[PDB]
Design a binder for this molecule. Structure first.
Ligand code: HEM
Length: 291
């Protein structure tokens, strides 16, 4: 199965900047969500989970088909809570009904990262909705209770290497774990709706204790009130991951650049872009537009 990007008919960069802007303006307006964290983090997670079902071996799942809109995928236990991101995007989709679902879910993530002062993420259009029977089964998203070997093997299926994995995990600066959602509870840091390299700094610099939460799962906790999942902590237990964690803790610009590449790649896995497709778009933030 080849998925060829097909530009929404007649649309160009300005059309998608309008969608970006509507997302960004709602992000600003709907600021109460999740005890004033706002929707940025869950939109980033929605983009990742809608992309992260991909299997490089047969090109099943991935962002192209926008299959989260079907009940098998929106009810995946691994996706608990993402319905909030979907509901956020609904009025956006109503205003811009021409955008594909995959294009909107992925653009939500890009827009959230950038509006949270993260790196620019180049973004390409052209995902096309595919039918209900193309929805991937549950179970392709990762478990959090595992070690570095798990994480490394998991991400090979998404064609990600060690650097790409450690970079992508930096998104756990954002938002928080919610006990009723994942069986884990707590934020990873203080700046959880501003995109920074804090995840790496906290991994290295907090004093972590292995505790059980109220769902009887182990997680790493600090006196500052932060947490790390076992899979996060695995990034400092494994010496290869550890080196890269230290690199990003010590170079914010490097983290931004590597995150941007890896996140674009994640969002584009499975898609074939024709030779004459438009170049990737780099959207201006609201701030850059004076909006
Ligand atoms: C080994 C890989 C990963 C595991 C096991 C993992 C697991 C988790 C878990 C358990 C949660 C908490 C869900 C909740 O209770 O609300 C979470 C939240 C989140 N994850 Fe991941 N994650 C991984 C990779 C990633 C990647 C690659 C990204 C994106 C680049 C990402 C972005 C997020 C964000 C932004 C949140 C916060 C969501 C919110 O506040 O609503 N995660 N992750």
């Amino acid at each position: 199965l080849v998925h060829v990007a097909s530009v929404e008919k007649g649309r160009s960069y300005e059309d998608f900047q309008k969608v970006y802007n509507a997302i960004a303006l709602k992000l600003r307006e709907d600021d109460e969500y999740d005890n004033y964290i706002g929707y940025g983090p869950v939109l980033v997670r929605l983009a990742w989970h809608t992309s992260g079902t991909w299997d490089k071996h047969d090109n099943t799942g991935g962002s192209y088909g926008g299959t989260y809109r079907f009940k098998k995928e929106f009810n995946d236990p691994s996706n608990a809570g993402l319905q909030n991101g979907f509901k956020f995007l609904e009025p956006i989709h109503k205003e811009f009904p021409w955008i594909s679902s995959g294009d909107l879910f992925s653009l939500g993530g890009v827009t959230a990262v950038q509006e949270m002062q993260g790196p620019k993420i180049p973004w390409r259009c052209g995902r096309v909705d595919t039918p209900e029977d193309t929805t991937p089964d549950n179970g392709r998203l990762p478990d959090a209770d595992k070690d570095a070997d798990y994480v490394r093997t998991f991400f090979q299926r998404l064609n990600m290497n060690d650097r790409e994995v450690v970079a992508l995990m930096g998104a756990h600066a954002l938002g928080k774990t919610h006990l009723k959602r994942s069986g884990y509870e707590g934020p990873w840091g203080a700046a959880n709706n501003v995109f920074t390299n804090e995840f790496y700094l906290n991994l290295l610099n907090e004093d972590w204790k292995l505790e059980k939460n109220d769902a009887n799962n182990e997680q790493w906790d600090s006196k500052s009130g932060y947490m790390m999942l076992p899979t996060d902590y695995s990034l400092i237990q494994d010496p290869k991951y550890l080196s890269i964690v230290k690199e990003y803790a010590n170079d914010q610009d490097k983290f931004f650049k590597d995150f941007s590449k890896a996140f674009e790649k994640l969002l584009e896995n499975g898609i074939t872009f024709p030779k004459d497709a438009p170049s990737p778009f780099i959207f201006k933030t609201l701030e850059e537009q004076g909006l």
